[PDB]
Amino acid sequence: HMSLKSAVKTVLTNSLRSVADGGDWKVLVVDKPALRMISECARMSEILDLGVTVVEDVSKQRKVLPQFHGVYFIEPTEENLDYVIRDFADRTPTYEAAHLFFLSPVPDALMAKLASAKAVKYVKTLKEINTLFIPKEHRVFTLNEPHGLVQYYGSRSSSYNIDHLVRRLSTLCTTMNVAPIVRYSSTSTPGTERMAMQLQKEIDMSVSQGLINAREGKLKSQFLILDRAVDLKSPLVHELTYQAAAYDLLNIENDIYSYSTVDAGGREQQRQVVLGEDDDIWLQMRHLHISEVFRKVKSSFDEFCVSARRLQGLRDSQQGEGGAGALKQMLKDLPQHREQMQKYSLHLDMSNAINMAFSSTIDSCTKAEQNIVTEEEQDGNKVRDFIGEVASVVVDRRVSTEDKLRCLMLCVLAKNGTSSHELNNLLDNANIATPSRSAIYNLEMLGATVVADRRGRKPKTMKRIERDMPYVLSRWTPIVKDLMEYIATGQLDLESYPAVRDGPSVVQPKESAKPKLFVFINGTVSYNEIRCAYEVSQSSGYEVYIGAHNIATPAEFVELVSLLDK
């Protein structure tokens, strides 16, 4: 389908247009998991002219509307069926009828409960959609589990339930319509290996079941399954590409950014907008270096104004207060363009905010982070005293606790073994409160070895591709990118990353086409790893899709790791 948002919207559309009603408006009754998935693939405006007039939460259900057919997107769960048998049960039904679409297969015990209750007479159509994964971005899928990392590697990991996880992920293959070879690391945790085994049988039990039909070209679709431990550095590094820097340095809760502009009059009007796929500047700009974004948004804004006046008949001889006076004159002269204007004012703002937040302090942290993480300087002079690299940052009292933590964590990852004593002293010199130190020690639970007496873990044996990295604060490349490119070239050892089946089917010489590569990392995915799936799609060979239980910024990843033992 190319985009996961397109793919998910298509299932919603194909399902809505299968509802056999009398042609009145529809009521879309929706789950929490359904709400999240649908909300991320369709605006309200796109739902309206798909013939639904309201969206409702399966819980509560006030306002009875018998003139309209109810359509349910909902999970095969007792709590839900009780809401359904309840919306009808009583004297007057709640909709003209119910059209039930289940997010995954419905058990028989529940099927019976529905058959015995009154509701049975009202249920017209009942299907199993096979889609329960959040389409966050065109190339990013998510499980809406913000504590995934904890539930999976934490001190309750034993009882995770990798079943519901395998089915959620196989969902990715049915709605995408592709039957991939499953790949995993030789050094996968047992929990993970099993998950990869089971995923293979799931998609296969779907293919011999005609839930997915493919042609199987020369190159093959693969589904790479990874432990967070594949790369513990990427989640931590300050990053200077637009999306990644915004989410790190700025306050972006649930994808909402707040800024201040002016309208006709009233100044400091505080707008909240969502960052997303329906904003053309966001796209195209989001994977660019921030220094370059700063100035293209400005260019694009000025070009837009100059052009939008030549489409009518005018000319910009009036420049007051710079580009603010352009924004005032545009909203006055060309009201038509009010929305493009809001779009530019948002990125003018966000661009600037990033530039300001990237203080000399943050630059210091970044330089140190790059040196530690690539293990050489801009120069190329190998760096060996990782603890010395950090000292500069850690004395600096202008530096956030969280920032110090990030540098410290990167430091013990590099050292790969540090004496209890030298480590307890580093933490003391850094003035890191003892409760906050679980961010360091809990790396053990992701297979890191931090203290030297716990015994070092055998070195990761994988060549790094080696790239031309121009920008001096952007020399680090996430490991996951190398995994991607190797696979897009069958060049990824079967001993290092074995297939469940058809192993020799990825041999190596010593638009709507192209094979898919799904990458799923347990726990957390990073914006720099997300960027990689895009870079690697537009470069060579495959179309790449990346995902995890949730997206975590560097701050959120620090919090998660600190929670692994609590």
Binding site: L48, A115, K124
Partner: protein, 220 residues
């Protein structure tokens, strides 16, 4: 499939209107918008067709359709604008009544608000297509028709731009044709103006599904 299996496993055991006038207006608005959409793409041809085309033989034949469809697009426009405004006032004069504290609203008012928002946008976007084809044609309805009609004066670059701009056989009618496109652009501008400020204190977030279903009610 799974529907058959249910009706098999269940046989082994044995209204008021609701906002009628409102759904009328939005049907009307949707319908008018679609009408305008088709009308716009016909004014497109009628304009580029009045280029050359055997002088006044067909010019009068075309300008007859143009200002006919133009007037319809306008009449359809004003209705849409009045139906929208009517719903705005209707909604505004229903806030305090349709909120029962709790922060929640009321399926009636929720529906009205998402309809009102969605269509106002759909409207500004359609009219923008209109505004674009008008100015698009008015720019060349002076370049490759009014100016290039200097087959009377040898005037070069400035004496044809410094003169034609101010006044503006068949070069006499194109003036009446340019000032048409001008009171068109003006109506549109006027419209876009109070349509823009009309989204103020509205939306910013309403197109988000999650937002709507958060302000739902309950308790029967």
């Amino acid at each position: 499939d799974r529907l058959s299996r249910l009706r098999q496993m269940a046989a082994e055991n044995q209204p008021e209107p609701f906002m009628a006038d409102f759904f009328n207006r939005v049907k009307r608005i949707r319908d008018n918008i679609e009408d305008i959409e088709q009308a716009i793409e016909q004014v497109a041809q009628l304009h580029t067709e009045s280029l050359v085309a055997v002088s006044k033989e067909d010019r009068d034949r075309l300008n007859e359709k143009l200002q006919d469809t133009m007037a319809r697009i306008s009449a359809l426009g004003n209705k849409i604008r009045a139906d929208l405004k009517q719903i705005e006032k209707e909604n505004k004069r229903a806030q305090q009544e349709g909120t029962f504290e709790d922060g929640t609203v009321s399926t009636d008012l929720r529906i009205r608000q998402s309809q009102h928002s969605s269509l106002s946008r759909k409207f500004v976007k359609v009219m923008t297509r209109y505004n674009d084809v008008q100015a698009e044609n008015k720019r060349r309805y002076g370049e490759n028709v009014a100016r290039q009609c200097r087959v009377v004066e040898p005037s070069l670059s400035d004496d044809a731009i410094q003169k034609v701009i101010e006044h503006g056989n068949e070069i006499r009618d194109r003036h009446k044709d340019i000032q048409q496109l001008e009171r068109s652009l003006l109506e549109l501008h006027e419209m876009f103006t109070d349509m823009s400020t009309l989204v103020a204190s509205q939306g910013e977030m309403i197109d988000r599904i999650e937002f709507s279903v958060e302000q739902s009610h309950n308790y029967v």
